[PDB]
Amino acid sequence: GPSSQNVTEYVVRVPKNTTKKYNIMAFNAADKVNFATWNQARLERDLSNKPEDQPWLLRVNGKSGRKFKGIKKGGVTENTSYYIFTQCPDGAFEAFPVHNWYNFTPLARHRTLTAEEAEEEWERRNKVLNHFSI
Amino acid sequence: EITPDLWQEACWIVISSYFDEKGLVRQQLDSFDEFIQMSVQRIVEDAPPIDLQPPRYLLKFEQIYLSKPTHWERDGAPSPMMPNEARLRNLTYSAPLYVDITKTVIKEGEEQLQTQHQKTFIGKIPIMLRSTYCLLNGLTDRDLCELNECPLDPGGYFIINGSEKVLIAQEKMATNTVYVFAKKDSKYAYTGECRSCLENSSRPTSTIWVSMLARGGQGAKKSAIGQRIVATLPYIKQEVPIIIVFRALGFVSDRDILEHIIYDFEDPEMMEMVKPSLDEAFVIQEQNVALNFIGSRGAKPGVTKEKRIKYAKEVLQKEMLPHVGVSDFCETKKAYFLGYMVHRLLLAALGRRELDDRDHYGNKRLDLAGPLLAFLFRGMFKNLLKEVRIYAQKFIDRGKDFNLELAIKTRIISDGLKYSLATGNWGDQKKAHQARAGVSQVLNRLTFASTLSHLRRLNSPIGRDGKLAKPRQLHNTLWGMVCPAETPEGHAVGLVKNLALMAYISVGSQPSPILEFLEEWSMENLEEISPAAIADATKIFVNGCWVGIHKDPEQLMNTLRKLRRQMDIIVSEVSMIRDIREREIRIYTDAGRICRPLLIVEKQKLLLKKRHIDQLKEREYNNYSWQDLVASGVVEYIDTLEEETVMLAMTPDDLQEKEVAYCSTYTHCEIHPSMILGVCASIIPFPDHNQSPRNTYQSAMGKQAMG
Amino acid sequence: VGIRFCQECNNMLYPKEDKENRILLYACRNCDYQQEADNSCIYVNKITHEVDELTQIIADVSQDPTLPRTEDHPCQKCGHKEAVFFQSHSARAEDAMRLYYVCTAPHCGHRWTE
Amino acid sequence: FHYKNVTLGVPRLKELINISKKPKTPSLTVFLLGQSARDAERAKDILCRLEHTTLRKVTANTAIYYDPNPQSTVVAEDQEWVNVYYEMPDFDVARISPWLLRVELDRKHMTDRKLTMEQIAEKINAGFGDDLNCIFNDDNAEKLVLRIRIMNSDENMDDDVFLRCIESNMLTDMTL
Amino acid sequence: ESRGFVENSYLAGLTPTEFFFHAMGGREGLIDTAVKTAETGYIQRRLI
Amino acid sequence: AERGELDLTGAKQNTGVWLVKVPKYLSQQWAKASGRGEVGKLRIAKTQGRTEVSFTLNEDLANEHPFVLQSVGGQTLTVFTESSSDKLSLEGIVVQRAECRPAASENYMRLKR
Numbered sequence A: 001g002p003s004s005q006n007v008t009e010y011v012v013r014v015p016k017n018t019t020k021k022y023n024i025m026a027f028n029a030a031d032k033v034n035f036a037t038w039n040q041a042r043l044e045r046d047l048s049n050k051p052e053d054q055p056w057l058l059r060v061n062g063k064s065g066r067k068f069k070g071i072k073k074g075g076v077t078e079n080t081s082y083y084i085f086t087q088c089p090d091g092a093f094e095a096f097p098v099h100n101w102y103n104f105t106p107l108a109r110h111r112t113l114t115a116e117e118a119e120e121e122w123e124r125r126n127k128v129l130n131h132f133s134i
Numbered sequence B: 001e002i003t004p005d006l007w008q009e010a011c012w013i014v015i016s017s018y019f020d021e022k023g024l025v026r027q028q029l030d031s032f033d034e035f036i037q038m039s040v041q042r043i044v045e046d047a048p049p050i051d052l053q054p055p056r057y058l059l060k061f062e063q064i065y066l067s068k069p070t071h072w073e074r075d076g077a078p079s080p081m082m083p084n085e086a087r088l089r090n091l092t093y094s095a096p097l098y099v100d101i102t103k104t105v106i107k108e109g110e111e112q113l114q115t116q117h118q119k120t121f122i123g124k125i126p127i128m129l130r131s132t133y134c135l136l137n138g139l140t141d142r143d144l145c146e147l148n149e150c151p152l153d154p155g156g157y158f159i160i161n162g163s164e165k166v167l168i169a170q171e172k173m174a175t176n177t178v179y180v181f182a183k184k185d186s187k188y189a190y191t192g193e194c195r196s197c198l199e200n201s202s203r204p205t206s207t208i209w210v211s212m213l214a215r216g217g218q219g220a221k222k223s224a225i226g227q228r229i230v231a232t233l234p235y236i237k238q239e240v241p242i243i244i245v246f247r248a249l250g251f252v253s254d255r256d257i258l259e260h261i262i263y264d265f266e267d268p269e270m271m272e273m274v275k276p277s278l279d280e281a282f283v284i285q286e287q288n289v290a291l292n293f294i295g296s297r298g299a300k301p302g303v304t305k306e307k308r309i310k311y312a313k314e315v316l317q318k319e320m321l322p323h324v325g326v327s328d329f330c331e332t333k334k335a336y337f338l339g340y341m342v343h344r345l346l347l348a349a350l351g352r353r354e355l356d357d358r359d360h361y362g363n364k365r366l367d368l369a370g371p372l373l374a375f376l377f378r379g380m381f382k383n384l385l386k387e388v389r390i391y392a393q394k395f396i397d398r399g400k401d402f403n404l405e406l407a408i409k410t411r412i413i414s415d416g417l418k419y420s421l422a423t424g425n426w427g428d429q430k431k432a433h434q435a436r437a438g439v440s441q442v443l444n445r446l447t448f449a450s451t452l453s454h455l456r457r458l459n460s461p462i463g464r465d466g467k468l469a470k471p472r473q474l475h476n477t478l479w480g481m482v483c484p485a486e487t488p489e490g491h492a493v494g495l496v497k498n499l500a501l502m503a504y505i506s507v508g509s510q511p512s513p514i515l516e517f518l519e520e521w522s523m524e525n526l527e528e529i530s531p532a533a534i535a536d537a538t539k540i541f542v543n544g545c546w547v548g549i550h551k552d553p554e555q556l557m558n559t560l561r562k563l564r565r566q567m568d569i570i571v572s573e574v575s576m577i578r579d580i581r582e583r584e585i586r587i588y589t590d591a592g593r594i595c596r597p598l599l600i601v602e603k604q605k606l607l608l609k610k611r612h613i614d615q616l617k618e619r620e621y622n623n624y625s626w627q628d629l630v631a632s633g634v635v636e637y638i639d640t641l642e643e644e645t646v647m648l649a650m651t652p653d654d655l656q657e658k659e660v661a662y663c664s665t666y667t668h669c670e671i672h673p674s675m676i677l678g679v680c681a682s683i684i685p686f687p688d689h690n691q692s693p694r695n696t697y698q699s700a701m702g703k704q705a706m707g
Numbered sequence C: 001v002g003i004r005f006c007q008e009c010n011n012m013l014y015p016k017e018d019k020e021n022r023i024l025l026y027a028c029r030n031c032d033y034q035q036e037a038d039n040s041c042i043y044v045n046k047i048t049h050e051v052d053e054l055t056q057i058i059a060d061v062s063q064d065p066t067l068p069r070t071e072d073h074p075c076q077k078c079g080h081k082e083a084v085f086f087q088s089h090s091a092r093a094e095d096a097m098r099l100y101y102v103c104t105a106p107h108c109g110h111r112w113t114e
Numbered sequence D: 001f002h003y004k005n006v007t008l009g010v011p012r013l014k015e016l017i018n019i020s021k022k023p024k025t026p027s028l029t030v031f032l033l034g035q036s037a038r039d040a041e042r043a044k045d046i047l048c049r050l051e052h053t054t055l056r057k058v059t060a061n062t063a064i065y066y067d068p069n070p071q072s073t074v075v076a077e078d079q080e081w082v083n084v085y086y087e088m089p090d091f092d093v094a095r096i097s098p099w100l101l102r103v104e105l106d107r108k109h110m111t112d113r114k115l116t117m118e119q120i121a122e123k124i125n126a127g128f129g130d131d132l133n134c135i136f137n138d139d140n141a142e143k144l145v146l147r148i149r150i151m152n153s154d155e156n157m158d159d160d161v162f163l164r165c166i167e168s169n170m171l172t173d174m175t176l
Numbered sequence E: 001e002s003r004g005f006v007e008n009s010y011l012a013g014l015t016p017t018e019f020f021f022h023a024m025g026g027r028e029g030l031i032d033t034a035v036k037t038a039e040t041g042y043i044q045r046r047l048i
Numbered sequence F: 001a002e003r004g005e006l007d008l009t010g011a012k013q014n015t016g017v018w019l020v021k022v023p024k025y026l027s028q029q030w031a032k033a034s035g036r037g038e039v040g041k042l043r044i045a046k047t048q049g050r051t052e053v054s055f056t057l058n059e060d061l062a063n064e065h066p067f068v069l070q071s072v073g074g075q076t077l078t079v080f081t082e083s084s085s086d087k088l089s090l091e092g093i094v095v096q097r098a099e100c101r102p103a104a105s106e107n108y109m110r111l112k113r
């Protein structure tokens, strides 16, 4: 097949400017997210921190949809820059710089908790079972 | 080309090459040249500026200089002092110290006015004799006699108020590693420890325990669930469950926490043990309430909420494991290491790995003059900057101006070092009660072999009357690195010890060039990997820090050893351990490890051919010496830790002959087994014929013989 | 005997009992994902602890230059006539002076006691 | 130490000098009155009768199964004896607990103390209450197993954690 | 011979590995005497 | 049309992108990109049991960098943008990662020996 006998040569350019900053949006493979299920998405900087440093908040499907939180990686160009390489209709390659790395993870909308009450809970549990002994 | 049974004259011709170059007190002279070329420049360079204020001012230090030791006469005319006048006139042998300071005024007054005052006087540092900064460096015997000095004097001591002081190397427990003990008296059934210090930059060293409570806790409640893993962080009052401190770093989910702690989910025996750790920590199930829980009990109980969430943020960020990373970023590393610390505590409870040994001599480090004066110079440079502010603020509120040559109190560094050296207590003058005593005693000049046996002496800092025998008995690991026969009687039996003849203490280096080689030799970083590709990989540590994994360890180990054989890229003083069973690889570069050379052995033959001998008996007019012998890969320095993964032969002509043989995979060979004795114990004829306590008496008795 | 993780929130699935069909159900305590148990046993506790370390020793120990070797006992799976033997070197050292062997031929790794 | 364990010398002296509660090896020497002082067999039987023996010393392994019905018999071969009990079915008073506890014993450690699970069976009942119920094999079968369920009067705090608490409590507080 | 049995005599001299084990035995025998004096002196003072 | 609204077009197009790690000195050479931004040409040779990619510097940029292909498995990677008009857009999903290295980095041969 062409992956075995395939051969080719293409030109690479690195434009000194772009119309938009380029970032990486990373997902855990273990989740195997079906992007087709994403009818829509909202994407906003996280509000816990109340800008460029702000973690992202991703809300899939507008109103009723999924939600992820994206946390910035420590470094992205500390030793080596990361580039996005894109194929163009002329076959030539275009390279785009990676501005930032954000880590996206899934969120658990159910199961709310209040440790104040749960602290008393663990003590009571550590008391009732300790009582009525022998 | 081989050396058959000409061995008895061949082993004594390489040992002559060793002592002709190194000498007997290179221990002392090399740690000093380090403290004064690097360890002093870094201290002033890595210091916070003193921005202060309307206008505001700048001050920062750039470069340090020194001059040859000098004495200021009665009328202010300087002159170089020779070491002899320092003894006769009860002077002190020291050298002045300068620095470059730059001062910029920032008032946004449409101009940033900067100015600098270079070579500003600071103080005076003592100078160890025969160093690279002494007046006797590199002189010939015709000139050493002309200044009334002895050409045989070894050097390696200070002259302070006429006296001659010598610094005693102090022992110390190794840092940045995990040790598992078992206190059989207290509530804990197991315990871990890790003393951390971020590359010679912190006055204290933060220590963190990871305990586990006892099984026989009398109480029906805890009887069923079992023991709960606890942690005792620094700067907090109360114990903390581990799942709580895990969530304070993020990682609130319990599928993500239990993959930093357990590396393979086909193990039901371990997962059962960590289950009752979640039940009690199924309380703080979100981040901010967790920070409040740990933030509630500190050195200051927070009255408000935001301060506790602030207070708990840095203590968990700048006091927890500072050796991994202190930046507020890269907090996935502090999670893995804290996971490895707990994964290793469970292995000690299922009985899959043995507990660590306290007196195993591979867990110890030695503090020479270098790492001792540098520790004492920090506490007196901060103390010098703390009192430029007090003089600037009092002087800038009136708004007049500023002048710095009058701000520097020069008596801080001069009288600071000179005091503690002369009297011994390793502290401050108003701190004659909080210091460690017994360092810096007076050189012994009774006989010439009592002088040499003083510049080579260790000291374990445990008490001098404790009846516990295990810090006093002879460890087997002391083979070849500490003299077995020489020790004093009385109350200090086994507490002070002398090191063997060829034992060599390392000086230290930077791990930068090995890390840059490791990443380009197919080592996956920790961040960009999945925690399921960790079961069949060998975790690679470097200097105490987990820095990746690797799916092919042995080739790397042999390659590294081979590189070390020529020391091609690796300072020949780094040790590289690989333990096949626990499936990891360790690398060390720090200062304090104790080494000794051995002979490298290939398949079953030595690597020292005859071509190396007939050109080594000619060093006088050939310029071929010990250094050209290490750089050719026939000898090699072997640490104590690395000495557990090695197979030694005592003598070539007798242990490396094919037969029905003991072993067949010898990796090294000794030079002569007589180099396991100290200085005062190697003047005894036929000591292999006496009873053992007799050899101890003479070694403590030839130190007081007239000559 | 193993462990069960939830398929939604990736947590530990607890066992529960339903009074309808008399079948073990594994439940979660964050969400309420459910499923039935196939082996229908929960707890097991081995006190004999007679685990044969033939399942714990690694095949690369035959690269150790500090272990004794033998020409008497050859390997069965490959016929190599050189082995390397040692002791239990673990706990359960009451009557533990057995002698496990490992073949030294490259890429055999066969292990056996006697 | 050059001489089992006895304390002599100056530490024994200052153990006699003071009367501190803690001798480093308290030991009562015992002598025997009857022909038991002569023959080794009666000496060994009174030996075993004096020594303390708990449960975890006579067990091989334990397992918590789930039998919602005593005829389910999840493990394959215990159906025989549990069934020959089942044709003589007694104590089905309130319910039948779906939670089971199965214990395996080591006849080596059993016979050395001259024990068999009959006396164990009554005393694990007589001494703890009647909340437990023990059916057992016949010792002619090589492996000695006895199965226990909670008294179903409690089913008309989870019973699983309670059964694990009881399991972890009986093997150390046995007092055989 | 690998765990401490010295099979020579003081007239025929010891081999290195035996000279080390002999040193170990002597060392412990040397520590015990250092402890004994203080212990016995103090206890006798109390009793008297 | 809203600030927090993210374009999903790239993803929904299943648009693929390539990811390449580049040394700073080369990247510093690249900030001096020739002409509009051209830096050179990429050469790709695939065989029945070997595939070779490399990049060659522009003659102007000069006044061979082989690629090491890296796996993207274990973590799904996509690229998302922020315009100078602050509009947000997803350009694509990462179908390749790589790291060009200088050829014959000195001794390595010595360290193999």
Ligand SMILES: [Zn+2]
Binding pocket: C006, C007, C008, C009, C010, C011, C028, C029, C030, C031, C032, C033
């Ligand atoms: Zn769940």
Ligand SMILES: [Zn+2]
Binding pocket: C075, C076, C077, C078, C079, C080, C103, C104, C105, C108, C109, C110
């Ligand atoms: Zn084989």
